[PDB]
Write a protein that binds this ligand. Structure first.
Ligand code: OVI
Length: 282
């Protein structure tokens, strides 16, 4: 589907993804005001050719992906201004779990439903032979109080086992990513582990992974932030058990954070486990 630039009316900026801005538009060809609300992702204007090929990549991936827990592609817009296309997606007014959970007291049962729905979307992603490479609470969007959608695919890549990585969300990344720059399907499950930690802290800034890891590492030697983080993880140190997180849910987090990638469960493994744990608490 092709949106006509001349019927896009901007309302507000929504945020910054990996290649450029997400803005809320009304698409109102009738001119009455009852037209659809749409989220439009655009390439930054002065972006160089490493970003542009990246952006063409993000466009290609979202156009192929169809799942109840991935953000709906609607179409593209001819952006004369940036001599490229704008990605047109469904609008989700509640935004990310990073924005939502700090203002809404959510129950444990509802957080594990979110966790389950994230695993179902990633299993789909993995079955289509893509890696996300930025699975974090900022990238998980809330459609409604019982329904999340993986929302941003700017770092996502087609696997021809693993893709060789070249900015980076290091505080969400497995030891093999940091040390060997190799991103495996199992590296996304590490990231899921940190996302699950984020949900159980209600994305409290002061309990965030950057904050918690730099508390362990310090900032007196900023140049070796990845080295010290790598050494800390290989020593087996981990983000703490969130307040009021059940012991077995923390065991599941630590399992997603196995140093050995091959010892981590797949998203396929996690779906039946998260269902059963959800139903226990609900
Ligand atoms: C300043 C106004 N802001 C808000 O009231 C909070 C808010 C922010 C953003 C949204 N929506 C969205 N946010 C992303 C998004 C992302 F997934 C990752 C990084 C940055 C982003 F903006 N993506 C999409 C949508 C959306 O509706 N459709 C796709 C909804 C509410």
């Amino acid at each position: 589907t092709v949106f006509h630039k001349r019927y896009l009316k901007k309302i507000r900026d929504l945020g910054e993804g990996h290649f450029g801005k997400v803005s809320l538009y009304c698409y109102d060809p009738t001119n009455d005001g009852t037209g659809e609300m749409v989220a439009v992702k655009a390439l930054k204007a002065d972006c160089g050719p490493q970003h542009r090929s990246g952006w063409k990549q993000e466009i290609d991936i979202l156009r192929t992906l169809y799942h109840e827990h991935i953000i709906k592609y609607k179409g593209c817009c001819e952006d004369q201004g940036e001599k490229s296309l704008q990605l047109v997606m469904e609008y989700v007014p509640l935004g990310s779990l990073r924005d939502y959970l700090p203002r809404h007291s959510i129950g444990l049962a509802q957080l594990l439903l979110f966790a389950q729905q994230i695993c179902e979307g990633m299993a789909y992603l993995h079955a289509q032979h893509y890696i996300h490479r930025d699975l974090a609470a900022r990238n998980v969007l809330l459609d409604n109080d019982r329904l999340v959608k993986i929302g941003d695919f700017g770092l996502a890549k087609a696997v021809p086992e693993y893709y060789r990585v070249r900015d980076s969300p290091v505080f969400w990344y497995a030891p093999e990513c940091l040390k060997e720059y190799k991103f495996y399907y199992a590296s996304d499950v590490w990231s899921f582990g940190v996302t699950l930690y984020e949900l159980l802290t209600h994305c409290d800034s002061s309990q965030s992974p950057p904050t918690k890891f730099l508390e362990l590492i310090g900032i007196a030697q900023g140049q070796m932030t990845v080295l010290r983080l790598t050494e800390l993880l290989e020593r087996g140190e981990r983000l703490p058990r969130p307040d009021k997180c059940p012991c077995e849910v923390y065991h599941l987090m630590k399992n997603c954070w196995e140093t050995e990638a091959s010892f981590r469960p797949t998203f396929e493994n996690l779906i039946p486990i998260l269902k059963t744990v959800h139903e226990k608490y609900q």
